[PDB]
Amino acid sequence: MLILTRRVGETLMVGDDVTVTVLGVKGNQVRIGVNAPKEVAVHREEIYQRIQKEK
Amino acid sequence: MLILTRRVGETLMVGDDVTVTVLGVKGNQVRIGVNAPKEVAVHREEIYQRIQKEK
Amino acid sequence: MLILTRRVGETLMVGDDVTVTVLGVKGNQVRIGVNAPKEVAVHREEIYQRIQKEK
Amino acid sequence: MLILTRRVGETLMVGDDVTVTVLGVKGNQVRIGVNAPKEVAVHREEIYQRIQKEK
RNA sequence: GCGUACAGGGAACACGCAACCCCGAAGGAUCGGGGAAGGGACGUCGCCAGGGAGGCGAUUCCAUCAGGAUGAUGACGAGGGACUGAAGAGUGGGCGGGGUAAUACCCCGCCCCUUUUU
Numbered sequence: 001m002l003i004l005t006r007r008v009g010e011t012l013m014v015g016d017d018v019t020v021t022v023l024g025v026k027g028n029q030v031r032i033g034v035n036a037p038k039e040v041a042v043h044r045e046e047i048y049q050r051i052q053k054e055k
Numbered sequence: 056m057l058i059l060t061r062r063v064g065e066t067l068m069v070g071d072d073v074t075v076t077v078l079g080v081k082g083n084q085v086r087i088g089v090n091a092p093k094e095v096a097v098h099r100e101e102i103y104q105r106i107q108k109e110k
Numbered sequence: 111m112l113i114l115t116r117r118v119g120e121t122l123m124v125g126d127d128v129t130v131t132v133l134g135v136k137g138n139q140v141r142i143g144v145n146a147p148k149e150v151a152v153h154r155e156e157i158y159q160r161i162q163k164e165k
Numbered sequence: 166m167l168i169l170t171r172r173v174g175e176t177l178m179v180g181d182d183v184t185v186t187v188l189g190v191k192g193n194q195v196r197i198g199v200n201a202p203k204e205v206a207v208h209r210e211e212i213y214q215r216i217q218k219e220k
Numbered sequence: 221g222c223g224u225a226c227a228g229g230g231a232a233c234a235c236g237c238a239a240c241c242c243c244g245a246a247g248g249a250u251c252g253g254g255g256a257a258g259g260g261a262c263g264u265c266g267c268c269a270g271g272g273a274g275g276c277g278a279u280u281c282c283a284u285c286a287g288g289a290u291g292a293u294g295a296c297g298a299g300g301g302a303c304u305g306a307a308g309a310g311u312g313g314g315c316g317g318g319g320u321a322a323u324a325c326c327c328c329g330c331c332c333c334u335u336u337u338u
Binding site: 111112113114115116117118141142144152158 | 228229230232297300301302303304305338
């Protein structure tokens with residue numbers, strides 16, 4: 001429900017040092033790196049969490 | 056600490072109530088947003104966390 | 111003498127290593143660029159080249 | 166940030182180095198000719214970076 | 221997003237119109253301003269109806285591997301010193317050769333133009 005249209009990098013910052021940042025882009029592919037801390041669970045919403053649900 | 060290379064249309068939700076994905080690309084600009092609930096506070100840069108730091 | 115080469119964009123001449131690439135397109139001309147220093151002097155199509163050949 | 170754009174009919178640079186010309190145009194692909202001093206180290210991004218990593 | 225054609229001193233913007241936001245005003249008359257950034261929009265871009273609807277196409281390098289690392293691998297051609305090269309397709313303009321009572325039309329070779337293979 002949101003849209004912000006960043007340019008270089010602006011954090012996420014819900015209060016747990018999770019920060020979105022655009023690193024690189026060419027063509028139609030965006031290097032988007034997130035320096036979230038290690039205690040939170042990061043994942044790709046794909047076949048990974050699909051087989052996590054289908055464990 | 057940075058995991059990246061998500062193509063247009065793909066999603067990268069970390070496994071919680073985040074729902075982060077790319078919303079298209081206008082060349083050198085990015086379209087990015089979430090449908091995270093308003094209980095957690097997602098914001099842009101220091102231009103919108105200086106209100107969070109009261110400065 | 112007149113060495114020729116090929117690009118789809120993002121050219122390179124070693125030795126300079128800072129600004130060798132203006133290789134974009136919008137139909138007729140060059141478009142892409144990020145940064146360039148003042149230590150690499152430039153001259154357009156005889157523009158200021160004539161005045162530096164004069165005085 | 167000192168990004169230029171000139172005519173694709175012909176091109177030149179400052180006088181201490183004899184420099185690039187322009188020959189072809191095909192979409193994003195482009196033929197580049199340079200009237201360069203052969204002796205000066207000139208290379209593209211193919212193998213020379215790897216052999217400099219070797220050296 | 222649509223565009224436009226630049227201007228030179230070194231500038232991802234140069235301008236217009238859309239797009240966006242906010243304000244005011246007279247209740248057959250719908251008018252005018254201001255800006256360039258905000259937020260909790262399950263988005264942007266196109267269409268279909270009875271006795272006051274519910275619907276349909278929709279992400280565009282088919283790359284290809286994954287993982288706590290300002291990740292990687294690639295993308296027709298490597299040396300280069302060349303108005304480079306190798307191909308493929310098509311357009312017509314042509315030049316010839318064969319077919320063709322003849323004309324018209326069919327096939328083959330070469331030059332130029334557009335497009336495809338980082």
